[PDB]
Design an enzyme around this catalytic site. Structure first.
Site, PDB file in Angstrom:
ATOM      1  N   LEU A 134       0.836  -1.200   0.000  1.00  0.00           N
ATOM      2  CA  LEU A 134       0.000   0.000   0.000  1.00  0.00           C
ATOM      3  C   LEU A 134       0.869   1.248   0.000  1.00  0.00           C
ATOM      4  N   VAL A 150       1.876   2.128  12.343  1.00  0.00           N
ATOM      5  CA  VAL A 150       0.776   2.098  13.299  1.00  0.00           C
ATOM      6  C   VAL A 150      -0.475   1.755  12.514  1.00  0.00           C
ATOM      7  CG1 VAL A 150       1.649   3.661  15.082  1.00  0.00           C
ATOM      8  CG2 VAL A 150       0.622   4.609  12.998  1.00  0.00           C
ATOM      9  N   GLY A 185      -3.517   2.110  12.292  1.00  0.00           N
ATOM     10  CA  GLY A 185      -4.625   2.913  12.776  1.00  0.00           C
ATOM     11  C   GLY A 185      -5.399   3.612  11.681  1.00  0.00           C
ATOM     12  N   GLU A 203      -6.809   7.390   9.637  1.00  0.00           N
ATOM     13  CA  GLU A 203      -6.465   8.738   9.222  1.00  0.00           C
ATOM     14  C   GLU A 203      -7.325   9.772   9.944  1.00  0.00           C
ATOM     15  OE1 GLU A 203      -5.381  11.456   7.443  1.00  0.00           O
ATOM     16  OE2 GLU A 203      -3.447  10.491   7.022  1.00  0.00           O
ATOM     17  N   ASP A 246       3.215  22.043   7.277  1.00  0.00           N
ATOM     18  CA  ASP A 246       2.225  21.351   6.455  1.00  0.00           C
ATOM     19  C   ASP A 246       1.141  20.734   7.310  1.00  0.00           C
ATOM     20  OD1 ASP A 246       1.365  20.712   3.813  1.00  0.00           O
ATOM     21  OD2 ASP A 246       2.142  18.660   4.026  1.00  0.00           O
ATOM     22  N   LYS A 306      -2.201  19.710   8.831  1.00  0.00           N
ATOM     23  CA  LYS A 306      -3.525  19.503   8.259  1.00  0.00           C
ATOM     24  C   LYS A 306      -4.022  18.103   8.592  1.00  0.00           C
ATOM     25  CE  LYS A 306      -1.757  18.318   3.647  1.00  0.00           C
ATOM     26  NZ  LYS A 306      -1.907  18.575   2.192  1.00  0.00           N
ATOM     27  N   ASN A 353      -2.338  15.117   7.168  1.00  0.00           N
ATOM     28  CA  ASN A 353      -1.014  14.690   7.618  1.00  0.00           C
ATOM     29  C   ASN A 353      -0.998  14.156   9.048  1.00  0.00           C
ATOM     30  OD1 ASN A 353       1.163  17.065   5.828  1.00  0.00           O
ATOM     31  ND2 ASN A 353      -0.274  15.492   5.120  1.00  0.00           N
ATOM     32  N   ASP A 355       4.695  12.823   7.193  1.00  0.00           N
ATOM     33  CA  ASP A 355       5.087  13.641   6.046  1.00  0.00           C
ATOM     34  C   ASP A 355       5.836  14.931   6.364  1.00  0.00           C
ATOM     35  OD1 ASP A 355       5.407  14.914   3.656  1.00  0.00           O
ATOM     36  OD2 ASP A 355       3.281  14.850   3.073  1.00  0.00           O
ATOM     37  N   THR A 404      -0.478  23.915   2.446  1.00  0.00           N
ATOM     38  CA  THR A 404      -1.766  23.580   1.840  1.00  0.00           C
ATOM     39  C   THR A 404      -2.560  24.880   1.829  1.00  0.00           C
ATOM     40  OG1 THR A 404      -1.706  21.335   2.766  1.00  0.00           O
ATOM     41  CG2 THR A 404      -3.822  22.120   1.958  1.00  0.00           C
TER      42      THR A 404
END
Lengths: 382, 230, 325, 382, 325
Positions: free
Chosen positions: C37, C111, C113, C115, C154, C156, C159, C172, C189
């Site tokens: 992935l 991890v 988990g 997002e 960054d 957000k 991330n 990231d 962003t």
């Protein structure tokens, strides 16, 4: 029939013994010869049916069968999927802000340049740029001639320039899904593609010229470099004027930069008043060019009366500062200050200064071996 | 197999046997060394069925089977006499000379009697009959009877010898007696085969015992006149 | 206080690893390979398991040659140097790094988990207590980072990852940069950009705090404070600084947010005299136990749910420049 | 014909294939029935006749024989002996001479009888018959009429009659050996066959009449009987006249018959002289009728002279005799004797008498007692 | 003389047998049978022999029935009575007589001698001495016969036989008849008939003497005195008495013959007074010894040379008349 016919005759010959057999034959067959039938039977018979009963038989077999059947059914596709996959970061091209080492020429008349300024007043990136940067930027704008029917920008295409119309007419088109709408036109006025000056991104509309025209263009990279370079030069310059001010020597690098970030600039024409005696002391100044005369009307010296005129207490030049007392007290200005010739000063608000670095008195004490010196400077004689 | 016994229909019509005697004599005046080939006076017969009877018990069994056959032959004839017309001459490969049985409805009836005879005898345990087709004939000479004939150049019956009798009507025999005859025993004084037993078909033979009387003869006279017209 | 202790020991630990990056640590033959992935629209990230220890890690595949194009090759060679030199509980970890003709492979911790972006969007918005929980973690992370003169740039939902313990894990570091002084790249962003970035005035730590203000607002509202359909409008709103708060926003929240979303650097929380304490001591964070959040002892409000075969070149290529790694 | 009839019909049924056998029979037998023509025959006569039965079985036999054959020439042999040549006796039919007892009438005129006498004069048997016998004989002659061409006598034939011709002509024929000669004829005169009057003997010639004629016939038997009878009567009569004469009484019977045999008879008419005196005495007489006168002329009585006249001495009659002396002497007659009327005397010659019986004197003496008497008678007185 | 003696004894012997004929004397079975000479033209005379004596005789067969016809049946019944009653040396003899159904059989003596007729005719004529010899025998025979009043009446050569002694034997008494008186049958033989017979005057012994004259003449001449070709002429000559004598006749003979052939009975010898002595004493017979001739002692002058089976009738027929026999 032949034998039976002749037998009847011959029986009668044997019985009767006639003397002439031929004459007896004529008589017998003539009497036979009449051939009358007393009775005759002609019959028609109805169909006749005979009924029998048939024999039994025995059949023996056993059979078993096993099977299983399953069925399925189908539906319309909707509902359709709803979720949206992602968002993204943006990034402009990097650049060494600190001036590499002096190492774009596009002619423009006063009217043209003046018109470019007007066309740029409201654009946010231009809106609050200083006099100099705006000039350098317009200098960098190259001309682009366009023939009728030509595409200035096409929706979807990557963008690198921002354009100001100089001459010509143009049609604006926007495609939404499968539909394209001729949404609006430009007639010798306009600008578009401002976003391209920030980062590379797809053009959101298509612009086509409908006549011979001329456009002023600006490339992102050129625009960003002009601006960054200039602001990084200004920062270094502001930094220096703060650094050479002894009152701020105990300041750390990062603390000077916070000042540089927010500090203002003002230009004063010879003779105009900068600080007026009596009003509230909100900020302090640092001369970066020219000279400043500090005057005081000698009345606030006794109990009611006197001088009531003009006296010069001090006279500052490039690198010096005045209004410092606003940093350590809260009493009206003691004296007035006037520009001696053309002046340029850095102006810092005291309240902002405190919110950022705390009270000035603490900074003065940071370096204890110079605390006294500093104190005598601020509240001392000269 | 080799038969030693047969069912025989004797020729009792003196005109037939007298005509054959004439035929035999005319052949003999042409060639007198054919003397021993001629069948003996008094021996004339039609063979109905051949068989083997190989002991006293089987000879008795044959006699029993012949007796049992009688009603069967009566059934077959369905109230009509069986008349056998003997006309013309034939040979079996130039070695056996015979008076022919004329064609007609009688031939099938005779064949039926022969097959019923075969069945009746076999059902009593007697090997009887043959696989070859029943072809009844009235033998008058056999070269095999005179072995010296080969030995001196006479090896077939010359067809010219009986030329004049080629379409000679010898006469008609009505079936009545059937004899069980020995092939090998000594012949009777009158020249006929030794007979173990005999039956008679006839009633003798009429549908009705009582005299017609002589009414039927009209049938015989007419039938004979019609046969002569053909 | 221990805060100073921690940061001091922290800077020490960091400067040491910063001035002597841990290059090519582990060997590729110690790790196998599982799922894959790591597509999307850039890079090749595939799951992998360990040998002796048998652990799970996320390995980023960066073809030494693949580089050179794209947008930059330093925003990475630099990214690697930072991930390796830093150590914080709410920061993803560079477990193992190595290269050779393959070259530049990142063995990040893993991890299993969920997002942050998916969670927030589903439920619409978080309750203020829940939002405060995640916020605290970001404040602490920024204090650590700024202590090392590093800016994230960054921030957000996209991330941020929610680990199996329900705590945040930041990912990231594409724009992460060590800056003492001022920097200038226009990056981040749209929705989260600071006025100073948009206008190229030069900047440093203050943009992260502004972003936090945006991040906190979106968590408690469901949408960002300067939203718009056109990027241009977003920026014009950002520059005007004018913000409208939902009806349900509490007073303490509005106040905190007016101070984080300050276009005026002389008034922005985090940038003033007290720095990050102006934030830590704000009435909105009064019920926050900073040490507890740090030790991950607080009970999170939400526990999340829980190919091919490439080869080397048998020869080292772009290793004539990616030396430092 | 029954089988043939049925066959012929059947042959035409087989040839013509008529659908209607009964109509075909009517026509066939009708056409047949006339049936011309049944027969032809010829009818002829058997001709039927009676016959002996036709058929016999034939016996078979074997036989043998032997023969003698004589062959000779053939001859008439007309003449054969005839050896004798021997004279045969003859004999007439016997007859009792002595008259049985009186127990032939054929008329004749004087001229006829007279003519018969003449015709008989010379025939020896008639020649010397006395008057009476001749008369009786002519009386006995019967007449025989003859027609011309008739045979009076035929040579060879036995003879019984003697014939005298009365009228007619006749031819005489004599056959000698094989020849016959017409030797002579008779013309109303003649006689023949005299021999037939003696005995039966063959006629020596044939006499045939040549005209109507008449003959006088005489049968032997009649002729002999007339003659014998008459001579036997005469003898008896002579015998008597001798017997009654006493002179002859001593004579024996046979001696008288010798006299009778020869003695004569004489008739004298009255007055005629029988004995003349003087002549010689030669015989003696015996008167059988009449009378006789004895005369003597008385002269011879003396001596010369006297009487010389006539004197009757005696006169004799029937039965007496005279001239007796001639028997005993021989002297001339003494006297004359004359017939007295008609006289018939028996005359006996003396010499014949003596030759036959010897001398008369001896006879006279034979009977001695009468000798004297006799002597006196002869020489006595009276 | 003995002449008278003889005749006397003769008449005695004759009258005895005459008045008592010797009938059926011998038996036919005493005589056999030999030849059969007895045909001619009448009668059946056959020779025969005797038994005991065995002599030869001449038997005349006279069928009792044969009689009745012919000329007469008495001239025989009488003939038999004479032959039987007479006995003389110059006369044939009736030896045996018998009859019965056969009846009348004459057994005459038999002399195997010759016929007078044959002898005389052969030699022509006899000498006078020889003639006188035979004549004497006839004279003597006639004297005997006339002594018995029997006349022969058939004198002729034909009726005279010459026996083996040469003496005459007279046969055939067909005309012999005893007559005392006169008789009348005209019989005899033409040549020998007397005038008185021819003329039927009646007669007796004189005819025999006339015949003798004829007989003597013929013997000495060879032919009879009155011969002629026609019987009539013979008789006319006989009646005329005229006779012509041959030249050679002696005188004595002529005289004797003129006296025998006398037509005049008053002059005929034998008929006169002396009878037969006129003859015996005639000069012609002077040399004759009469006794000698009688006793047959004289020597004769000439010695001569030397069929079927009939039966009776087993029954006597004509015996109803032929009694006397």
């Amino acid at each position: 029939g032949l034998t039976e016919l002749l037998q009847g005759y011959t029986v009668e010959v044997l019985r009767q013994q006639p003397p002439d057999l031929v004459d007896f034959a004529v008589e017998y067959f003539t009497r036979l010869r009449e051939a009358r039938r007393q009775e005759s039977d002609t019959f028609i018979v109805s169909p006749t049916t005979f009924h029998t009963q048939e024999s039994s038989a025995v059949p023996v077999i056993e059979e078993d069968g096993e099977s299983d059947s399953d069925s399925e059914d189908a539906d319309l596709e909707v509902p359709v999927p709803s979720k949206f996959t992602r968002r993204v970061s943006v990034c402009a091209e990097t650049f060494n802000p600190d001036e590499e080492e002096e190492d774009v020429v596009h002619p423009k008349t006063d009217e043209q340049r003046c018109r470019l300024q007007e066309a740029c007043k409201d654009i946010l990136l231009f809106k609050n740029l200083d006099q100099e940067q705006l000039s350098q930027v317009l200098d960098a704008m190259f001309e682009k001639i366009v023939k009728t029917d030509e595409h200035v920008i096409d929706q979807g295409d990557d963008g690198d320039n921002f354009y100001v119309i100089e001459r010509g007419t143009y049609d604006i088109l926007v495609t939404k899904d499968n539909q394209t709408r001729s949404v609006g036109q430009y007639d010798n006025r306009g600008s578009f593609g401002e976003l391209a000056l920030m980062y590379n991104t797809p053009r959101a509309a298509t612009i086509i010229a409908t006549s011979e025209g001329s456009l002023w263009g600006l490339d992102r990279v050129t625009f960003r470099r002009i601006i960054v370079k200039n602001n990084a030069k200004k920062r270094k310059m502001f930094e220096s004027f703060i650094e050479s001010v002894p009152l701020f020597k105990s300041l750390e690098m990062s603390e000077r930069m916070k000042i540089v970030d927010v500090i203002g600039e003002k230009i004063y024409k010879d003779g105009e008043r900068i600080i007026a005696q009596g009003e509230k002391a909100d900020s302090f100044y640092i001369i970066e060019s020219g000279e400043v005369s500090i005057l005081i009307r000698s009345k606030t010296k006794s109990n009611k009366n006197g001088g009531n005129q003009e006296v010069e207490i001090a006279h500052c030049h490039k690198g010096q500062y005045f209004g410092e007392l606003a940093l350590v007290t809260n009493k009206p200005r003691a004296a007035s200050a006037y520009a001696v010739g053309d002046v340029k000063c850095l102006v810092m608000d005291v309240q902002a200064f405190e919110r950022l670095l705390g009270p000035c008195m603490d900074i003065m004490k940071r370096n204890i071996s110079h605390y006294e010196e500093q104190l005598v400077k601020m509240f001392g004689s000269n | 197999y080799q038969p030693n016994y047969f069912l025989s229909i004797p020729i009792t019509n003196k005109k037939i046997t007298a005509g054959i005697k004439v035929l035999q004599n005319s052949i003999l005046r042409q060639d007198n060394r054919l003397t021993k080939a001629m069948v003996g006076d008094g021996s004339f017969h039609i063979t109905l069925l051949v068989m083997q009877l190989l002991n006293e018990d089987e000879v008795n069994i044959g006699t029993d089977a012949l007796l049992e056959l009688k009603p069967f032959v009566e059934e077959i004839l369905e109230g009509k006499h069986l008349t056998l017309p003997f006309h013309g001459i034939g040979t079996f490969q130039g070695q056996v000379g015979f008076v022919k049985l004329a064609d007609g409805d009688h031939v099938s009836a005779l064949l039926e009697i022969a097959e019923t005879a075969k069945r009746t005898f076999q059902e009593k345990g007697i090997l009887a009959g043959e696989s070859r087709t029943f072809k009844p004939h009235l033998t008058f000479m056999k070269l095999s009877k005179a072995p010296m004939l080969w030995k001196k150049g006479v090896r077939k019956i010359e067809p010219g010898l009986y030329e004049q009798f080629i379409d000679h009507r010898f006469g008609e025999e009505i079936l009545y007696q059937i004899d069980l005859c020995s092939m090998l025993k000594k012949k009777q004084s009158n020249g006929y085969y030794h007979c173990e037993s005999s039956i008679v078909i006839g009633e003798k033979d009429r549908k009705e015992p009582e005299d017609a009387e002589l009414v039927r003869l009209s049938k015989r006279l007419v039938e004979n006149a019609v046969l002569k017209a053909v | 206080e221990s805060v100073k202790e921690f940061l001091a020991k922290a800077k020490e630990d960091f400067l040491k690893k910063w001035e002597t990056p841990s290059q090519n640590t582990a060997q590729l033959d110690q790790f196998d390979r599982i799922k894959t992935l790591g597509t999307g629209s850039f890079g090749r990230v595939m799951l992998v398991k360990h040998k002796e220890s048998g652990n799970h890690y996320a390995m980023k595949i960066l073809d030494k040659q693949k580089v050179v194009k794209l947008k930059q090759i330093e925003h990475t060679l630099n990214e690697k140097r930072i991930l390796q030199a830093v150590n914080f509980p709410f920061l993803v970890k560079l477990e193992f790094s190595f290269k050779d003709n393959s070259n530049l492979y990142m063995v990040m911790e893993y991890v299993a988990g969920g997002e942050m972006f998916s969670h927030l969007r589903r439920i619409g918005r978080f309750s203020e207590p829940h939002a405060r929980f995640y916020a605290a973690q970001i404040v602490l992370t920024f204090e650590y980072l700024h202590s090392l003169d590093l800016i994230y740039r960054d921030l957000k939902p996209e991330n941020l990852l929610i680990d199996q313990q329900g705590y945040i894990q930041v990912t990231d570091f594409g724009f992460a940069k060590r800056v003492k002084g001022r920097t200038w790249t226009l990056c981040g962003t749209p929705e989260y950009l600071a006025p100073e970035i948009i206008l190229s005035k030069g900047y440093n730590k203050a943009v992260d705090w502004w972003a936090l203000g945006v991040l906190i607002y979106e968590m408690a509202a469901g949408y960002p404070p300067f939203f718009a359909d056109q990027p241009i409008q977003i920026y014009e709103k950002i520059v005007s600084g004018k913000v409208r708060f939902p009806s349900h926003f509490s007073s303490d929240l509005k106040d905190l947010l007016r101070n984080l979303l300050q276009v005026d650097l002389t008034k922005r929380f985090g940038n003033l005299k007290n720095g990050v304490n102006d934030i830590k001591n704000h009435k909105w964070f009064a019920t926050t136990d900073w040490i507890a959040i740090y030790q991950r002892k607080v009970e999170a409000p939400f526990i999340p749910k829980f190919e091919e075969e490439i080869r080397v070149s048998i020869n080292e290529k772009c290793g004539k420049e990616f030396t430092e790694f």
